[PDB]
Design a protein around this motif. Structure first.
Motif, PDB file in Angstrom:
ATOM      1  N   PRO A  33       3.545  18.921   0.183  1.00  0.00           N
ATOM      2  CA  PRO A  33       3.333  17.802  -0.726  1.00  0.00           C
ATOM      3  C   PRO A  33       2.617  16.656  -0.036  1.00  0.00           C
ATOM      4  O   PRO A  33       2.820  16.417   1.163  1.00  0.00           O
ATOM      5  CB  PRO A  33       4.758  17.407  -1.132  1.00  0.00           C
ATOM      6  CG  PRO A  33       5.602  17.881  -0.039  1.00  0.00           C
ATOM      7  CD  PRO A  33       4.974  19.138   0.447  1.00  0.00           C
ATOM      8  N   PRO A  34       1.762  15.930  -0.755  1.00  0.00           N
ATOM      9  CA  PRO A  34       1.073  14.790  -0.145  1.00  0.00           C
ATOM     10  C   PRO A  34       1.998  13.622   0.148  1.00  0.00           C
ATOM     11  O   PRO A  34       2.538  12.994  -0.767  1.00  0.00           O
ATOM     12  CB  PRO A  34       0.021  14.422  -1.195  1.00  0.00           C
ATOM     13  CG  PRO A  34       0.544  14.928  -2.445  1.00  0.00           C
ATOM     14  CD  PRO A  34       1.284  16.174  -2.123  1.00  0.00           C
ATOM     15  N   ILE A  35       2.183  13.330   1.430  1.00  0.00           N
ATOM     16  CA  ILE A  35       3.058  12.219   1.822  1.00  0.00           C
ATOM     17  C   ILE A  35       2.557  10.933   1.181  1.00  0.00           C
ATOM     18  O   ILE A  35       1.333  10.697   1.136  1.00  0.00           O
ATOM     19  CB  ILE A  35       3.121  12.089   3.352  1.00  0.00           C
ATOM     20  CG1 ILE A  35       1.711  12.089   3.957  1.00  0.00           C
ATOM     21  CG2 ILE A  35       3.954  13.216   3.911  1.00  0.00           C
ATOM     22  CD1 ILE A  35       1.668  12.123   5.467  1.00  0.00           C
ATOM     23  N   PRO A  36       3.442  10.067   0.677  1.00  0.00           N
ATOM     24  CA  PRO A  36       2.963   8.870  -0.037  1.00  0.00           C
ATOM     25  C   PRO A  36       2.151   7.921   0.824  1.00  0.00           C
ATOM     26  O   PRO A  36       1.048   7.518   0.432  1.00  0.00           O
ATOM     27  CB  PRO A  36       4.267   8.224  -0.521  1.00  0.00           C
ATOM     28  CG  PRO A  36       5.293   8.698   0.425  1.00  0.00           C
ATOM     29  CD  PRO A  36       4.907  10.087   0.793  1.00  0.00           C
ATOM     30  N   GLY A  37       2.674   7.543   1.987  1.00  0.00           N
ATOM     31  CA  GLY A  37       2.015   6.581   2.845  1.00  0.00           C
ATOM     32  C   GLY A  37       0.561   6.902   3.111  1.00  0.00           C
ATOM     33  O   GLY A  37      -0.328   6.143   2.713  1.00  0.00           O
ATOM     34  N   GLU A  38       0.301   8.019   3.782  1.00  0.00           N
ATOM     35  CA  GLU A  38      -1.072   8.390   4.081  1.00  0.00           C
ATOM     36  C   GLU A  38      -1.862   8.551   2.789  1.00  0.00           C
ATOM     37  O   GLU A  38      -1.399   9.171   1.828  1.00  0.00           O
ATOM     38  CB  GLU A  38      -1.104   9.686   4.891  1.00  0.00           C
ATOM     39  CG  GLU A  38      -0.525   9.566   6.295  1.00  0.00           C
ATOM     40  CD  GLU A  38      -1.275   8.580   7.175  1.00  0.00           C
ATOM     41  OE1 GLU A  38      -0.871   8.407   8.344  1.00  0.00           O
ATOM     42  OE2 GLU A  38      -2.274   7.993   6.712  1.00  0.00           O
ATOM     43  N   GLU A  39      -3.064   7.984   2.772  1.00  0.00           N
ATOM     44  CA  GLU A  39      -3.906   8.023   1.587  1.00  0.00           C
ATOM     45  C   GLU A  39      -4.602   9.372   1.476  1.00  0.00           C
ATOM     46  O   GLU A  39      -5.137   9.890   2.460  1.00  0.00           O
ATOM     47  CB  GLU A  39      -4.938   6.897   1.637  1.00  0.00           C
ATOM     48  CG  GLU A  39      -4.338   5.496   1.577  1.00  0.00           C
ATOM     49  CD  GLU A  39      -3.632   5.200   0.265  1.00  0.00           C
ATOM     50  OE1 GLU A  39      -3.136   4.065   0.103  1.00  0.00           O
ATOM     51  OE2 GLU A  39      -3.583   6.090  -0.610  1.00  0.00           O
ATOM     52  N   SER A  40      -4.589   9.938   0.272  1.00  0.00           N
ATOM     53  CA  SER A  40      -5.219  11.215  -0.017  1.00  0.00           C
ATOM     54  C   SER A  40      -6.140  11.055  -1.218  1.00  0.00           C
ATOM     55  O   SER A  40      -6.271   9.970  -1.791  1.00  0.00           O
ATOM     56  CB  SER A  40      -4.174  12.304  -0.283  1.00  0.00           C
ATOM     57  OG  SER A  40      -3.344  11.955  -1.373  1.00  0.00           O
ATOM     58  N   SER A  41      -6.775  12.159  -1.603  1.00  0.00           N
ATOM     59  CA  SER A  41      -7.686  12.188  -2.734  1.00  0.00           C
ATOM     60  C   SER A  41      -7.166  13.034  -3.884  1.00  0.00           C
ATOM     61  O   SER A  41      -7.869  13.192  -4.887  1.00  0.00           O
ATOM     62  CB  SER A  41      -9.052  12.718  -2.291  1.00  0.00           C
ATOM     63  OG  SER A  41      -8.944  14.038  -1.790  1.00  0.00           O
ATOM     64  N   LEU A  42      -5.961  13.584  -3.767  1.00  0.00           N
ATOM     65  CA  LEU A  42      -5.387  14.413  -4.817  1.00  0.00           C
ATOM     66  C   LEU A  42      -4.902  13.513  -5.943  1.00  0.00           C
ATOM     67  O   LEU A  42      -3.947  12.750  -5.772  1.00  0.00           O
ATOM     68  CB  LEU A  42      -4.254  15.268  -4.261  1.00  0.00           C
ATOM     69  CG  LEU A  42      -4.661  16.480  -3.433  1.00  0.00           C
ATOM     70  CD1 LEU A  42      -3.443  17.100  -2.803  1.00  0.00           C
ATOM     71  CD2 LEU A  42      -5.385  17.497  -4.283  1.00  0.00           C
ATOM     72  N   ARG A  43      -5.569  13.598  -7.088  1.00  0.00           N
ATOM     73  CA  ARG A  43      -5.234  12.826  -8.272  1.00  0.00           C
ATOM     74  C   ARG A  43      -5.068  13.761  -9.459  1.00  0.00           C
ATOM     75  O   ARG A  43      -5.744  14.788  -9.562  1.00  0.00           O
ATOM     76  CB  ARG A  43      -6.313  11.792  -8.583  1.00  0.00           C
ATOM     77  CG  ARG A  43      -6.001  10.387  -8.124  1.00  0.00           C
ATOM     78  CD  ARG A  43      -5.854  10.289  -6.634  1.00  0.00           C
ATOM     79  NE  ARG A  43      -5.655   8.909  -6.214  1.00  0.00           N
ATOM     80  CZ  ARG A  43      -5.441   8.530  -4.961  1.00  0.00           C
ATOM     81  NH1 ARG A  43      -5.390   9.424  -3.986  1.00  0.00           N
ATOM     82  NH2 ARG A  43      -5.279   7.247  -4.683  1.00  0.00           N
ATOM     83  N   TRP A  44      -4.152  13.399 -10.354  1.00  0.00           N
ATOM     84  CA  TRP A  44      -3.948  14.108 -11.612  1.00  0.00           C
ATOM     85  C   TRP A  44      -4.021  13.086 -12.735  1.00  0.00           C
ATOM     86  O   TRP A  44      -3.121  12.253 -12.879  1.00  0.00           O
ATOM     87  CB  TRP A  44      -2.616  14.850 -11.626  1.00  0.00           C
ATOM     88  CG  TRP A  44      -2.524  15.923 -10.604  1.00  0.00           C
ATOM     89  CD1 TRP A  44      -2.806  17.239 -10.779  1.00  0.00           C
ATOM     90  CD2 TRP A  44      -2.127  15.777  -9.239  1.00  0.00           C
ATOM     91  NE1 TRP A  44      -2.611  17.927  -9.613  1.00  0.00           N
ATOM     92  CE2 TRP A  44      -2.192  17.050  -8.650  1.00  0.00           C
ATOM     93  CE3 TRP A  44      -1.719  14.696  -8.459  1.00  0.00           C
ATOM     94  CZ2 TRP A  44      -1.869  17.268  -7.321  1.00  0.00           C
ATOM     95  CZ3 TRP A  44      -1.403  14.915  -7.149  1.00  0.00           C
ATOM     96  CH2 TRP A  44      -1.475  16.189  -6.589  1.00  0.00           C
ATOM     97  N   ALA A  45      -5.083  13.158 -13.531  1.00  0.00           N
ATOM     98  CA  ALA A  45      -5.335  12.181 -14.584  1.00  0.00           C
ATOM     99  C   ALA A  45      -5.335  10.765 -14.017  1.00  0.00           C
ATOM    100  O   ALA A  45      -4.852   9.819 -14.641  1.00  0.00           O
ATOM    101  CB  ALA A  45      -4.315  12.316 -15.710  1.00  0.00           C
TER     102      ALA A  45
END
Ligand SMILES: CN[C@@H]1[C@H](O[C@H]2[C@H](O[C@H]3[C@H](O)[C@@H](O)[C@H](NC(=N)N)[C@@H](O)[C@@H]3NC(=N)N)O[C@@H](C)[C@]2(O)C=O)O[C@@H](CO)[C@H](O)[C@H]1O
Ligand code: FES
Ligand SMILES: [K+]
Ligand SMILES: [Mg+2]
Ligand SMILES: [Mg+2]
Ligand SMILES: [Mg+2]
Ligand SMILES: [Mg+2]
Ligand SMILES: [Mg+2]
Ligand SMILES: [Mg+2]
Ligand SMILES: [Mg+2]
Ligand SMILES: [Mg+2]
Ligand SMILES: [Mg+2]
Ligand SMILES: [Mg+2]
Ligand SMILES: [Mg+2]
Ligand SMILES: [Mg+2]
Ligand SMILES: [Mg+2]
Ligand SMILES: [Mg+2]
Ligand SMILES: [Mg+2]
Ligand SMILES: [Mg+2]
Lengths: 74, 97, 48, 86, 122, 72, 23, 137, 128
Positions: free
Chosen positions: H7-19
């Motif tokens: 799962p994408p850890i909240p703190g670190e910024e990622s590009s996984l977006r849903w709507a």
RNA sequence: AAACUCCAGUUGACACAAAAUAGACUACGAAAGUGGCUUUAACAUAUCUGAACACACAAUAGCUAAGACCCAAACUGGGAUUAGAUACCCCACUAUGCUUAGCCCUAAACCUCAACAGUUAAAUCAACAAAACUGCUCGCCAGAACACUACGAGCCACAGCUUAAAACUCAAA
């Protein structure tokens, strides 16, 4: 089995007998029934391989001693 | 007598006994980056010596160190810190496939 | 030899006189005890 | 409780293939042992019964490892008979 | 003996963090300790939520205090860390550098057990 | 035998070379055996240390045209 | 092995403890 | 880039977006797969109840509640109350090894909800309380 | 009870330890050591006081001194841990092993028997 | 079916209880027994053997007294099954399990294989199980059942433990 052919040929070449096949129980200790009452058993058994295919002594080693036959073995 | 007879000697061809990856290194409870290499990334369970490949003496040093770091506020329990997920894998365990 | 080595170290030991100064130095530096290992047995120090 | 959520025992879904995520998740819980642990914790297993089960599971492993080690050692001899006829 | 005090302080400012360290190091000297060093492991996020002194903490500062003290000072110092409101969690352990590691020659192979059953034709 | 210590060290440093054994040939001399013969011959001279004797044996084979590529 | 010799002591003891509670 | 199962850890910024929403913002579908029932409750990221459904609330009784058809029916009923509130993507947190553990997840997919993750939060003690004694049936 | 300032058995011999810092002499004392470093000094005192040759530790005289210091160690542990049955058995067996040492020493060398009984304060008693 | 319905689910705060993984390890301790963390103290003996009772220990259950109480749970109550069901299945609840202070002193306390030293040859050994022996010593046993009984004695034990017979009876066990 690898040397079964070679041994059978040599026996024929030297005017002697061979048994490189499955030893049926009673060849020696029951020859009278299997062959006949007036049968003559071997006077000398030469073992080129004293073990069978499951790495255990050939039954003839023990059966040749019961019939007081001298054995030669490798 | 004869000089070609063999002599009483220890095997010279003998190869040195194998060692674990952590042989000769000090296993501390503050090195959570090393202790997280021997725990599951999903459950946080400690792996055994058939997975880690460690010896009996070093497998018990990781175990004792993990339990002490967990109750001191150094290491999680229910999961593996995500920061140490991109570290070299030394354990023989494949999940996905 | 152990006594001689210890005699040198004791000088660095924290004392009441230098207690305040040492605390500030500790708050400026950081000590990292984290280091991973590979399958070959090599230590991978963290790049920080 | 006191740990961060959505890290432990969490699997992400690829291209809407939920089945593969659940099969992957169920394979992670079985390899770690949670599945059987949750099934043995439904009813209390007395120490004597748990010690009788650990021995059976350890003796089966030993036997199955050696039995497998012999099957892989003797599989080289599963080839055709080279002395066909003798 | 030589101990190691794994100290986890409450996330505060520099003036208050140094006041706690000094107040904590003076408690050791009062009990007969010979403090040797004061390492800073940095401020990080706690592995789990720690509840201390009617407060739920999520961050804290990690400090190590290497020192020498008599055996009777550990029980007296563990009771002082429980009353300090700025000390989340603090444990005293025997220093790992006072435990020599015996040299290893490697893994010794173990041969399968023999003569466990009689050589009889069951 | 006494030459087993010399062989164990030759294989570690150099290992089995390109040349392959011919066990059928009763009078077959391997590269390592050639090394052992020279090593023994130089011992008769009087050198009493292995390290110098071992290093000096290699140089002779190189002069004779033998190829001794190290595991490097 | 059977427990036929244990069952005799089992009933002997049960009959004796039941008589001490009655008397 | 590639695809990770973690799962994408909240703190670190990622590009996984849903709507246009981060992993943290997605609502959560808490499934409780029991042995004789299966309760489903959809909540938001801020712990706001959006929908609740269970085999009992769908008109099942006794031994019909501990089936895979009743769990699927409760998933469809919880995916119809949350789809009216603007729910499309959910994070499943299944709790329990019951029959309606995976069947309720299928019912949520048969209601218009898209599952982005599957979390297991089955209560496992590190020995705590003693369970009931084994039974002779 | 040796004072806490007493140096350890090992360090006291080393030359040049008389003139060092006060902090180095406090780290090498019994204050920063465990209980087993204070028992090694008690045993040393008795040997010089009692035995003719302290260097020999395999003698019957030395073993009695070494075991009597353990007996006292257990009595101090059992005054605080009354319900410790493990160390109550180590004490009673050690008192029985010392009685077997005093009997064999009283039968071989009665001169040392009086010396040890006086030095250690042991009132030998005959069995029933 | 009964039961509960200030019930259930999420979140958060929150233990005098119990101690996943590691442990595919095989350790400590006289045994009993011991597997969360830390610290302190700490693990008899330079010949062996040596006790139902001396001396000191000894799982669980249980007694006395004062506390605690999540869960479990003899008894009991309710529901159902059944020819019946003082049982097996379901629910609920207590003594109890925990702590402290005393007691009790039992076990398939069984690795049913005494302690120490030694050997692998010879006649290998009824069978089975966990190959067969030697030396030394302590302890125990001599058909089955009556009998983990009776009497006596002793014990903080008063429906108790330990030690422990005989008569009638059978020709087998
Ligand atoms: C070799 N004899 C076996 C033996 O017979 C025995 C058998 O002896 C029985 C006694 O009379 C009876 O009072 C006795 N009854 C008792 N209550 N004590 C029987 O236990 C006893 N049977 C037995 N020990 N197996 O009956 C007797 C008449 C017998 O024939 C005497 O020799 O036991 C019989 C079985 O009871 C077998 O059938 C016989 O083969
Ligand atoms: S092999 Fe030497 S420590 Fe593991
Ligand atoms: K047993
Ligand atoms: Mg009877
Ligand atoms: Mg635990
Ligand atoms: Mg004895
Ligand atoms: Mg007696
Ligand atoms: Mg008894
Ligand atoms: Mg008891
Ligand atoms: Mg009790
Ligand atoms: Mg209850
Ligand atoms: Mg009823
Ligand atoms: Mg209760
Ligand atoms: Mg037992
Ligand atoms: Mg004995
Ligand atoms: Mg009798
Ligand atoms: Mg009894
Ligand atoms: Mg009685
Ligand atoms: Mg009486």
């Amino acid at each position: 089995r690898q040397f079964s052919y070679l041994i059978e040929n040599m026996a024929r070449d030297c005017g002697e007998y061979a048994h490189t096949r499955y030893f049926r129980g009673g060849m020696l200790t029951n020859a009278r029934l299997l062959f006949g009452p007036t049968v003559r058993l071997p006077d000398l058994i030469i073992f080129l391989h004293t073990l069978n295919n499951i790495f255990e002594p050939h039954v003839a080693v023990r059966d040749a001693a019961k019939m007081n036959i001298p054995t030669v073995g490798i | 007598s004869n000089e070609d007879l063999p002599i009483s000697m220890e095997n010279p061809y003998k190869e040195p006994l194998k060692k674990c990856i952590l042989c000769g290194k000090h296993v501390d409870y503050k090195n959570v980056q090393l202790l997280s290499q021997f725990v599951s990334p999903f459950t946080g369970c400690i792996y055994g010596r058939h997975i880690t490949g460690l010896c009996g003496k070093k497998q018990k040093e990781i175990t004792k160190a993990i339990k002490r770091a967990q109750i001191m506020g150094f290491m999680p329990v229910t999961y593996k810190d995500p920061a140490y997920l991109k570290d070299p894998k030394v354990c023989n365990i494949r999940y996905r496939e | 030899r152990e006594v001689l080595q210890l005699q040198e170290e004791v000088k660095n030991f924290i004392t009441r006189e230098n207690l305040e100064a040492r605390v500030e130095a500790a708050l400026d530096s950081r000590k990292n005890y984290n280091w991973a290992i590979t399958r070959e047995g090599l230590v991978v120090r963290p790049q920080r | 409780a006191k740990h961060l959520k959505f890290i432990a025992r969490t699997v992400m879904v690829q291209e809407g293939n939920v089945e593969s995520a659940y099969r992957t998740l169920n394979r992670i819980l079985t390899m770690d042992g949670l599945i059987e642990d949750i099934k043995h914790r439904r009813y209390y297993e007395k120490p004597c019964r748990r010690r009788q089960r650990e021995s059976y599971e350890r003796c089966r492993r030993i036997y199955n490892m050696e039995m497998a080690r012999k099957i892989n050692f003797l599989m080289r001899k599963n080839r055709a008979d080279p002395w066909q006829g003798c | 003996p030589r101990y190691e005090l794994a100290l986890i302080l409450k996330a505060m400012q520099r003036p208050e963090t140094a006041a706690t360290l000094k107040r904590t190091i003076e408690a050791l000297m009062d009990r007969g300790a010979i403090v040797r060093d004061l390492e800073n492991l940095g401020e990080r996020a706690l592995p789990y939520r720690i509840s201390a002194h009617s407060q739920q903490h999520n961050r804290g500062g990690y400090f190590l205090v290497d020192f020498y003290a008599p055996t009777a000072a550990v029980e007296s110092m563990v009771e002082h860390l429980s009353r300090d409101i700025d000390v989340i969690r603090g444990n005293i352990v025997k220093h790992p550098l006072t435990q020599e590691l015996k040299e290893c020659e490697g893994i010794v192979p173990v041969p399968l057990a023999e003569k466990l059953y009689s050589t009889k034709k069951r | 035998y006494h030459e087993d210590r010399i062989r164990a060290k030759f294989y570690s440093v150099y290992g089995s070379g390109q040349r392959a054994f011919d066990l059928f040939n009763p009078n077959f001399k391997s590269t390592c055996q050639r090394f052992v013969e020279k090593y023994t011959e130089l011992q008769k001279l009087g050198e009493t240390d292995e390290e110098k004797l071992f290093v000096e044996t290699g140089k002779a084979l190189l002069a004779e045209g033998v190829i001794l590529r190290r595991v490097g | 092995k059977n427990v036929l010799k244990i069952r005799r002591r089992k009933m002997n003891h049960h009959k004796y403890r039941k008589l001490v509670k009655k008397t | 880039t590639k695809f990770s199962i973690y799962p994408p850890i909240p703190g670190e910024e990622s590009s996984l977006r849903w709507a246009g929403k981060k992993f943290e913002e997605i609502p959560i579908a808490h499934i409780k797969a029991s042995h004789n029932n299966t309760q489903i409750q959809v909540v938001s990221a801020s712990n706001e109840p959006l929908a609740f459904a269970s085999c009992g609330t769908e008109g099942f009784r006794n031994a019909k509640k501990g089936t895979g058809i009743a769990a699927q029916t409760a998933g469809i009923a919880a995916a119809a109350r949350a789809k009216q509130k603007g729910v499309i993507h959910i994070r499943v947190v299944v709790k329990g090894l019951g029959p309606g553990r995976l069947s309720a997840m299928h019912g949520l997919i048969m209601g218009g909800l898209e599952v982005i993750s599957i979390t297991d939060n089955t209560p496992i003690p590190h020995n705590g309380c003693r369970p009931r004694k084994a039974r002779k049936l | 009870d040796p004072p806490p300032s007493t140096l350890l058995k090992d360090y006291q011999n080393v030359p040049g330890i008389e003139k060092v810092d006060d902090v180095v002499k406090r780290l090498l004392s019994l204050e920063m050591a465990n209980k087993k470093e204070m028992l090694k000094i008690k045993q040393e005192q008795f040997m010089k006081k009692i035995v003719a040759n302290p260097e020999d530790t395999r003698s019957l005289e030395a073993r009695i001194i070494a075991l009597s210091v353990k007996i006292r160690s257990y009595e101090e542990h059992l005054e605080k841990h009354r319900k410790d049955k493990a160390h109550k058995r180590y004490l009673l067996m050690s008192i029985d092993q010392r009685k077997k040492m005093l009997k064999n020493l009283r039968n071989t060398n009665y001169d040392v028997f009086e010396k040890i009984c006086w030095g250690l304060g042991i009132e030998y008693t005959f069995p029933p």
